[PDB]
């Protein structure tokens, strides 16, 4: 059983992009943040704790355009109860066609690895966007590196990566670009 169902008609000819959440698109903290973008109540051992979420600059534009260009899949190492409510608030456009969480990762040598072979998509047409090189150790030639983001509001990395993804969305084989 693959991680994804069969691609829907509106997605099957597009490249599939696996997108990480934490430190890629947003940064979440248990420490109080003034002027947070979202605050999500998360229950741990029956006690509610407020999680403070900041959005990376240019993420709305980035997520909107990627949802058009690609079959977008949220693939996080975190548990659904962190990731789900954040995605709900973030994905205004139905960009994420599927959500995969901690259970879907392989724990390999102390790292959560996102194993692209389990997806059920032709790997010539799969990309991964993740701030942790560790998550794509099995598929390093499918990857578009992005720097870890915490709270730097001068960051332009999501914006500067768009022309590149614009190009990748049109190719037949991602490996002809990434090697």
One character per residue 8-27, x = contact with Mg ion (rule: CB under 5 A):
------------x-xxx---
Binding mask 85-124 for Mg ion (x = CB under 5 A): ----------------------------------------
Q: Which is nearer to Mg ion, 24 or 28 (CB)?
A: 24
Query: In whole angstroms, how close is the CB of 164 to Mg ion at the nearest point?
Result: 19
Q: Is 84 in the site for Mg ion (CB under 5 A)?
A: no
CB of 146 to Mg ion, least distance (A): 9
- φ, ψ for residue 16, nearest 5 deg: -90, 125
Task: Tell the smallest beta-carbon distance from residue 170 to Mg ion (Å).
Answer: 27
Q: Which residues bind Mg ion (CB under 5 A)?
A: 20, 22-24, 131
């Amino acid at each position: 059983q693959y991680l994804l169902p069969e691609a829907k008609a509106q997605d099957s000819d597009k490249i599939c992009v696996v997108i990480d959440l934490a430190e890629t698109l947003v940064h979440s903290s248990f420490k109080p943040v003034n002027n947070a973008d979202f605050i999500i109540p998360v229950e741990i051992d029956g006690v509610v704790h407020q999680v403070y979420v900041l959005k990376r600059p240019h993420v709305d534009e980035f997520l909107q355009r990627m949802g058009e260009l690609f079959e977008c899949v949220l693939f996080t190492a975190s548990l659904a109860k962190y990731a789900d409510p954040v995605a709900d608030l973030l994905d205004k456009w139905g960009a994420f066609r599927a959500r995969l969480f901690r259970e879907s990762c392989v724990f390999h040598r102390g790292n959560y690895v996102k194993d692209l072979s389990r997806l059920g998509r032709d790997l010539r047409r799969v990309l991964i966007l993740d701030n942790s090189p560790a998550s794509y150790v099995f598929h390093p030639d499918n990857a578009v590196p992005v720097a870890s983001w915490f709270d730097n509001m001068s960051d332009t990395e999501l914006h500067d990566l768009l022309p590149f993804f614009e190009q990748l969305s049109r190719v037949d084989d991602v490996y002809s670009v990434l090697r």
